Amino acid sequence: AACYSSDCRVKCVAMGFSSGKCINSKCKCYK
Known part of the structure; x- marks a missing residue:
């Protein structure tokens, strides 16, 4: 599983x- 900051966001x-x-x-989320 590849972690993407764009998908995460x-x-x-x-x-x-x-x-x-x-x-x-x-x-991680940018609350």
Whole structure:
């Protein structure tokens, strides 16, 4: 599974966030 900051962000924007990224292999949201 490839972690993408662009995909992560989209998941965060839809889940109520200001953005999102990807670390070692875990998506984080930009609350």
